[PDB]
Design an enzyme around this catalytic site. Structure first.
Site, PDB file in Angstrom:
ATOM      1  N   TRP A   1     -11.574  -2.975 -37.304  1.00  0.00           N
ATOM      2  CA  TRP A   1     -12.861  -3.676 -37.272  1.00  0.00           C
ATOM      3  C   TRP A   1     -12.701  -5.022 -36.565  1.00  0.00           C
ATOM      4  O   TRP A   1     -11.593  -5.398 -36.192  1.00  0.00           O
ATOM      5  CB  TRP A   1     -13.512  -3.800 -38.657  1.00  0.00           C
TER       6      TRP A   1
ATOM      7  N   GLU B   1     -13.251 -12.945 -31.906  1.00  0.00           N
ATOM      8  CA  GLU B   1     -13.155 -12.124 -30.685  1.00  0.00           C
ATOM      9  C   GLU B   1     -14.496 -12.139 -29.940  1.00  0.00           C
ATOM     10  O   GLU B   1     -14.547 -12.331 -28.721  1.00  0.00           O
ATOM     11  CB  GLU B   1     -12.779 -10.678 -31.026  1.00  0.00           C
TER      12      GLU B   1
ATOM     13  N   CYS C   1      -1.311  -7.747 -33.595  1.00  0.00           N
ATOM     14  CA  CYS C   1      -2.391  -7.396 -34.515  1.00  0.00           C
ATOM     15  C   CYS C   1      -2.291  -8.125 -35.858  1.00  0.00           C
ATOM     16  O   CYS C   1      -1.319  -7.962 -36.599  1.00  0.00           O
ATOM     17  CB  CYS C   1      -2.429  -5.884 -34.760  1.00  0.00           C
TER      18      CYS C   1
HETATM   19  C1  HEM Z   1      -8.438  -2.987 -39.829  1.00  0.00           C
HETATM   20  C2  HEM Z   1      -8.903  -3.931 -38.890  1.00  0.00           C
HETATM   21  C3  HEM Z   1      -8.237  -4.528 -37.805  1.00  0.00           C
HETATM   22  C4  HEM Z   1      -8.421  -5.814 -37.359  1.00  0.00           C
HETATM   23  C5  HEM Z   1      -9.324  -6.923 -37.924  1.00  0.00           C
HETATM   24  C6  HEM Z   1      -7.658  -6.004 -36.171  1.00  0.00           C
HETATM   25  C7  HEM Z   1      -7.747  -7.161 -35.372  1.00  0.00           C
HETATM   26  C8  HEM Z   1      -7.155  -7.377 -34.162  1.00  0.00           C
HETATM   27  C9  HEM Z   1      -7.311  -8.544 -33.282  1.00  0.00           C
HETATM   28  C10 HEM Z   1      -8.006  -9.877 -33.530  1.00  0.00           C
HETATM   29  C11 HEM Z   1      -6.601  -8.302 -32.155  1.00  0.00           C
HETATM   30  C12 HEM Z   1      -6.632  -9.144 -30.887  1.00  0.00           C
HETATM   31  C13 HEM Z   1      -7.649  -8.565 -29.887  1.00  0.00           C
HETATM   32  C14 HEM Z   1      -7.778  -9.400 -28.637  1.00  0.00           C
HETATM   33  O1  HEM Z   1      -7.464 -10.606 -28.702  1.00  0.00           O
HETATM   34  O2  HEM Z   1      -8.192  -8.866 -27.581  1.00  0.00           O
HETATM   35  C15 HEM Z   1      -5.967  -7.020 -32.352  1.00  0.00           C
HETATM   36  C16 HEM Z   1      -5.074  -6.476 -31.458  1.00  0.00           C
HETATM   37  C17 HEM Z   1      -4.405  -5.275 -31.587  1.00  0.00           C
HETATM   38  N1  HEM Z   1      -4.554  -4.425 -32.657  1.00  0.00           N
HETATM   39 FE1  HEM Z   1      -5.551  -4.770 -34.412  1.00  0.00          FE
HETATM   40  N2  HEM Z   1      -6.961  -4.866 -35.865  1.00  0.00           N
HETATM   41  C18 HEM Z   1      -7.317  -3.932 -36.828  1.00  0.00           C
HETATM   42  C19 HEM Z   1      -6.926  -2.584 -36.790  1.00  0.00           C
HETATM   43  C20 HEM Z   1      -6.079  -2.040 -35.828  1.00  0.00           C
HETATM   44  C21 HEM Z   1      -5.709  -0.640 -35.737  1.00  0.00           C
HETATM   45  C22 HEM Z   1      -6.346   0.479 -36.578  1.00  0.00           C
HETATM   46  C23 HEM Z   1      -4.785  -0.558 -34.694  1.00  0.00           C
HETATM   47  C24 HEM Z   1      -4.086   0.525 -34.191  1.00  0.00           C
HETATM   48  C25 HEM Z   1      -3.842   1.677 -34.927  1.00  0.00           C
HETATM   49  C26 HEM Z   1      -4.633  -1.886 -34.151  1.00  0.00           C
HETATM   50  C27 HEM Z   1      -3.847  -2.168 -33.035  1.00  0.00           C
HETATM   51  C28 HEM Z   1      -3.787  -3.344 -32.342  1.00  0.00           C
HETATM   52  C29 HEM Z   1      -3.096  -3.539 -31.090  1.00  0.00           C
HETATM   53  C30 HEM Z   1      -2.005  -2.704 -30.465  1.00  0.00           C
HETATM   54  C31 HEM Z   1      -3.507  -4.721 -30.608  1.00  0.00           C
HETATM   55  C32 HEM Z   1      -3.129  -5.325 -29.262  1.00  0.00           C
HETATM   56  C33 HEM Z   1      -4.207  -5.082 -28.217  1.00  0.00           C
HETATM   57  C34 HEM Z   1      -3.876  -5.703 -26.890  1.00  0.00           C
HETATM   58  O3  HEM Z   1      -2.692  -6.014 -26.669  1.00  0.00           O
HETATM   59  O4  HEM Z   1      -4.793  -5.892 -26.061  1.00  0.00           O
HETATM   60  N3  HEM Z   1      -5.435  -2.788 -34.828  1.00  0.00           N
HETATM   61  N4  HEM Z   1      -6.322  -6.438 -33.566  1.00  0.00           N
HETATM   62  N1  LIG Z   2     -10.327  -5.937 -33.918  1.00  0.00           N
HETATM   63  C1  LIG Z   2      -9.868  -5.219 -32.896  1.00  0.00           C
HETATM   64  N2  LIG Z   2      -9.264  -4.062 -33.119  1.00  0.00           N
HETATM   65  O1  LIG Z   2      -9.304  -3.505 -34.329  1.00  0.00           O
HETATM   66  N3  LIG Z   2      -9.991  -5.674 -31.653  1.00  0.00           N
HETATM   67  C2  LIG Z   2      -9.532  -4.959 -30.463  1.00  0.00           C
HETATM   68  C3  LIG Z   2      -9.780  -5.736 -29.197  1.00  0.00           C
HETATM   69  C4  LIG Z   2     -11.239  -6.084 -29.078  1.00  0.00           C
HETATM   70  C5  LIG Z   2     -11.541  -7.226 -28.108  1.00  0.00           C
HETATM   71  N4  LIG Z   2     -10.791  -8.417 -28.494  1.00  0.00           N
HETATM   72  C6  LIG Z   2     -13.048  -7.512 -28.111  1.00  0.00           C
HETATM   73  O2  LIG Z   2     -13.441  -8.602 -28.586  1.00  0.00           O
HETATM   74  O3  LIG Z   2     -13.819  -6.638 -27.649  1.00  0.00           O
END
Ligand code: HEM
Ligand SMILES: N=C(NO)NCCC[C@H](N)C(=O)O
Ligand code: HEM
Ligand SMILES: C[C@H](O)[C@H](O)[C@H]1CNC2=NC(N)=NC(=O)C2=N1
Ligand SMILES: C[C@H](O)[C@H](O)[C@H]1CNC2=NC(N)=NC(=O)C2=N1
Ligand SMILES: N=C(NO)NCCC[C@H](N)C(=O)O
Ligand SMILES: [Zn+2]
Lengths: 420, 420
Positions: free
Chosen positions: A290, A295, A118
C-alpha cells in the site's frame, strides 16, 4: 566477526551477522561510496541470450532448498533430502527446474524481506501470491494483471499481492511488462511549451503512441499496459477504467484545494522488476503493498520532474512564494501531505503516514536482528522525503547488502528488444 | 575512466574524475555499503606513540607542494622547485617540516573544500586562518580560543575562521581540545529522574565536574574549555560570558513561544577534529562557519537524545499530540524552524535556511565539476533533516570519497589519555 550498529536515538546497539551471506559485489568501491546512485548495476539484472550455466544454477538451487527447509520449526528432513534429490535430477534432465508453489511463496516473501529499499517490510509475511507461471500469451498476461489489480485494490482496503509469470528460459522468450507500474499517468509535451500529466512517463507515453495508443491529452490519463510475452513484440492493452481506483484530493480545511482538480491512483504496483531465487529469474512479477503518503504528496505532486504543484499550492495558501527563507515550501508540502492522508482516510483507501511506517520498520529491524542477525537496509531510501530526523529511522545506523532471494531492476525493454 | 552522475531534477549529467585521487580505503566494503555509519574508522585519525615514518611523510609532503604550486594561474616554477628542495632538506634534517603560512591557508581551505559532509562549501575561499602553531601552554591555548570566538562572532555578523595549534610531533605531546565544540551546553542527570540542558554533553559534563568545574545546574549552562597542551593533563578554563553570544528564540506569531525560555549560541565551532595535510596532522584546529537553521531548530531542539521539545511545542500549538497520523510533528518543527530563522534575523545574527544552502551547494557542485572534475559529497549528511525532496540536493547523485588535505574525527581523549 560482526559489524557493530548503533541507534543514536535510544543508544541501543545491534550486531550484524547477516551481511556475511551477501551475494557478490555491491554498489560501492574500495575508496568510494556510491550509495546515492539510483540505478547501479549491483541492483540490476540484465537480459540474456543463452540459458543459465548448470554449474552456476545447481549450487544456487541447493542453497535455496536448504534455506527453505531450514525455515520450518521442526524440519522435515526426509522431505528436505528428497527435494534436494528431485531438484538436482530436474536440473540435469531439463536444464532448469520449477519451484513448488510453497517455495515460490517463501521466495517472494523472503525477497521482500530482503528489499533494502522497502520500509513496509514488517508486513513481509502477509502477501498473496498469484501463480501465472503457466501463462503464454499477451492476452493471458493482460487478464492476469487485471485480476491482480482487482484483488490488490479490494475496493480501497488494499492487500499486498504479487503475480509471477514464466521464468526466463533462454533469455529470448522473456515475459516483460514495459510499464514502470501497473497504473501510471501519461505525460504530454503540449503545444504551448508546457507538459501535461506526469512528466516522468513522457518517453513511454510516446512509445505507447507509436504503438497505436489513443492520446487522451490530459493530466490523469491512465496509461495502457504494454505487454511482451514469450519474447514477442509488445501488445498494447488499455486498462478497464472500472479497475483503476483513484482518490480525489481534498484538504480538511482548505476547501479551495479540490479546485486544483487533483487525484492519484490508490494502487502502488511496481511492474518492471525481476525476482531472483535459487538461481532462477522471473523478469515479470508485478507486485504491490500500500501507499505511504509522502510518495504521492511529496514526490509525485511536488518533484520538479513530476507534477510540480508547489508553486501554486503556496500561492493559494498566501505564503511568501518569492522568498525561500520564509519556509513556505515547508508549510505547503505539509498541507499537501495531510490532504493526501485525509483524502485516503475519508474515501476508505488504505494508506500510511511516514511517521507510523518508520516506527513499524524500527520494530521490524529489532525483530529481524533478533531473528536472523541483521536486516539489509538502504538508509537513503528508507528515510522519508520530509521530516528526516523527526523520524526514528534517521537515527538508526544500517548496513545495505544484496541477499537472495531478491528483487532486481532491469534494463528498459525498448532499449534491448528485437523487432520482428 | 570516470563515474557518470545524474541529477534527477534537471536531467543534467556530470562526469566524476576526482574520485581517482582518493587516499585509501573508505567506509564501505566490497559487498556492503556502510555510508550510514556516523563515526567510521575511514573518517577517523587516531593517536600515535612515535613520529611519522619518513618514507610515508616525504611522498605526501611532495604531493602537497605540487598541489599547492599547481594552484596559481601562472605557476612560479623556480619557487616550486625551490620549495620541493627545502621541504625535503627539512624532513631529512628535522624528521618533519613546517608549512608556510600561505600553504596552511591553502590547506585549510582545500580541506574544507574536501569536507564531504559540509553543505556550506561554496564559501571555501573565504576563511580566516589563525596561526597558533607557536602555542605551548594551556593558558595560551585558552587565549587563542578566546580571540577566535571573538573574531568569528563579530557581534552576530559571523565570519568563517579556523585556528591552528602545533602539529603532532611524536604523538605524546598532542594539543587537544576535549570539548565537542567551542561553545556547548551542559547536561545534568537531575534528582527527579529527568535531564536538564543538553543530554548529549552528559558524560562530558561529569568529566568537567570531576576536574573541579562548578555545576550551575541549568538548561543553557555554557560548558568550560578543557584544554590539553603538549600532552599534559587537561586544564579547565571557564569561557568569559561576554564572548558567548546567544539568541533567544521567539516566533513572529506565537508570542507564547518565548515563554519556553529557549535560546542557543550563535557560534557553530567544531573543536575536536584533526587537520591532515601533506603528511602532517594538527590534532587541534577548532573551526567555524555559520549556522543552518535546521541544526538548531530540528536537531538540537527536537532530537530525542537532545533537548526534545517537540511534545510540548505541539501541545502549545493545540495539535493532536496523541495521533501520529495528524502530522503534528511536521507542523511543529516547521514553526520551530521559522522561529530560529526569525530570531537570528531579528537579532542580526547570521544564519541560513536549508533551502538557500542547498541551492548554493548545488551551484558549488557545478562549479566544482567544471573546475576539478568532481566534488566529494556525503548525501546522507548534505540532505537536510527536514524537507528532503523539496531540496535540490536530494535529487543529485553524488560520490563520497576522502581526499587530502582533509578534516578527520579523533578518538575521544579521555579514553586514551595518560594521567600524570
Ligand atoms: C505493505 C505495504 C508496503 C509499503 C507501505 C511499502 C512502501 C514502500 C515505499 C515507500 C517504497 C519506496 C518507493 C519509492 O520511493 O519509489 C517501497 C519500495 C519498495 N518496496 Fe515496499 N511497501 C509495501 C509492500 C511491498 C511489497 C508487497 C513488496 C514486494 C513483495 C515491496 C517491495 C519493495 C521494493 C523492491 C521496493 C523498491 C522499489 C524501487 O527500487 O523502485 N513492498 N515500498
Ligand atoms: N508503497 C509502494 N509499494 O508498496 N510503493 C511503490 C512505488 C510507488 C511510487 N513511489 C509511487 O509513488 O507511485
Ligand atoms: C560558511 C558557513 C558554513 C555552513 C553553513 C556550514 C554548514 C555545515 C552543516 C549543516 C554541517 C553539518 C553539521 C551537523 O550535522 O552536525 C557542517 C559540517 C561540517 N562542516 Fe561546514 N559549514 C560552513 C563552514 C565550514 C567551515 C569554515 C569549515 C571548515 C573549515 C567547515 C567544515 C565542516 C566539516 C568538516 C563538517 C563535518 C562535521 C562533522 O563531521 O561532525 N564548515 N557544516
Ligand atoms: C539521487 C537520489 O539517489 C534519489 O533522489 C533518491 C533518494 N532516495 C530516495 N528514496 C526513495 N524512497 N525513493 C526515491 O526515489 C529516492 N530517490
Ligand atoms: C545514523 C545516521 O548516520 C545519523 O543519524 C546521521 C544522518 N545524517 C546526518 N546529517 C547531518 N548533517 N548531521 C548528522 O548528525 C547526521 N547524522
Ligand atoms: N554550520 C556548522 N559549521 O559551520 N555547523 C557545525 C556543527 C554544529 C552542530 N550541528 C550544532 O548544531 O551545534
Ligand atoms: Zn557505500
Amino acid at each position: 566477526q560482526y559489524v557493530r550498529i548503533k541507534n543514536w536515538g535510544s543508544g541501543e546497539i545491534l550486531h550484524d551477522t547477516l551481511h556475511h551471506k551477501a551475494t557478490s559485489d555491491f554498489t560501492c568501491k574500495s575508496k568510494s561510496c556510491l550509495g546515492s546512485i539510483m540505478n547501479p548495476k549491483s541492483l540490476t539484472r540484465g537480459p540474456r541470450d543463452k540459458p543459465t550455466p548448470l554449474e552456476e544454477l545447481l549450487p544456487h538451487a541447493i542453497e535455496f532448498i536448504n534455506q527453505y527447509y531450514g525455515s520450518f520449526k521442526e524440519a522435515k528432513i526426509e522431505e528436505h533430502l528428497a527435494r534436494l534429490e528431485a531438484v538436482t535430477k530436474e536440473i540435469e534432465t531439463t536444464g532448469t527446474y520449477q519451484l513448488t508453489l510453497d517455495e515460490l511463496i517463501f521466495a517472494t516473501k523472503m525477497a521482500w524481506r530482503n528489499a533494502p529499499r522497502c520500509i513496509g517490510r514488517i508486513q513481509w509475511s502477509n502477501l498473496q501470491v498469484f501463480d501465472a507461471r503457466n501463462c503464454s500469451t499477451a492476452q493471458e498476461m493482460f487478464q492476469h494483471i487485471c485480476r491482480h489489480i482487482l484483488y490488490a485494490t479490494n475496493n480501497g482496503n488494499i492487500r499486498s499481492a504479487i503475480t509471477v509469470f514464466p521464468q526466463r528460459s533462454d533469455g529470448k522468450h522473456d515475459f516483460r511488462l514495459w510499464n514502470s507500474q501497473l497504473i501510471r499517468y501519461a505525460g504530454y509535451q503540449m503545444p504551448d511549451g508546457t507538459i501535461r500529466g506526469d512528466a516522468a512517463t513522457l518517453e513511454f507515453t510516446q512509445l505507447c503512441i507509436d504503438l497505436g495508443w489513443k492520446p487522451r491529452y490530459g493530466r490523469f490519463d491512465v496509461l495502457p499496459l504494454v505487454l511482451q510475452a514469450d519474447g514477442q513484440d509488445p501488445e498494447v492493452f488499455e486498462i478497464p477504467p472500472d479497475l483503476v481506483l483513484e482518490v480525489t484530493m481534498e484538504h480538511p480545511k482548505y476547501e479551495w484545494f479540490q479546485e486544483l482538480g487533483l487525484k492519484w491512483y490508490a494502487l502502488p504496483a511496481v511492474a518492471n522488476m525481476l525476482l531472483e531465487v535459487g538461481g532462477l529469474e522471473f523478469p515479470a512479477c508485478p507486485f504491490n503493498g500500500w501507499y505511504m503518503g509522502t510518495e504521492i504528496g511529496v514526490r509525485d505532486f511536488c518533484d520538479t520532474q513530476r507534477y510540480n504543484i508547489l508553486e501554486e499550492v503556496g500561492r493559494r495558501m498566501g505564503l511568501e512564494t518569492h522568498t525561500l527563507a520564509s519556509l513556505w515550501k515547508d508549510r505547503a508540502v505539509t498541507e499537501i501531505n495531510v490532504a493526501v492522508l485525509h483524502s485516503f482516510q475519508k474515501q476508505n483507501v488504505t494508506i500510511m503516514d511516514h511517521h507510523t511506517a518508520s516506527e513499524s520498520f524500527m520494530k521490524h529491524m529489532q525483530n529481524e536482528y533478533r531473528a536472523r542477525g541483521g536486516c539489509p537496509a538502504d538508509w537513503i531510501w528508507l528515510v522519508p522525503p520530509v521530516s528526516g530526523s523527526i523520524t526514528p529511522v534517521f537515527h538508526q545506523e544500517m548496513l545495505n547488502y544484496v541477499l537472495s532471494p531478491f528483487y532486481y531492476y532491469q534494463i528498459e525493454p525498448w532499449k534491448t528488444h528485437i523487432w520482428q
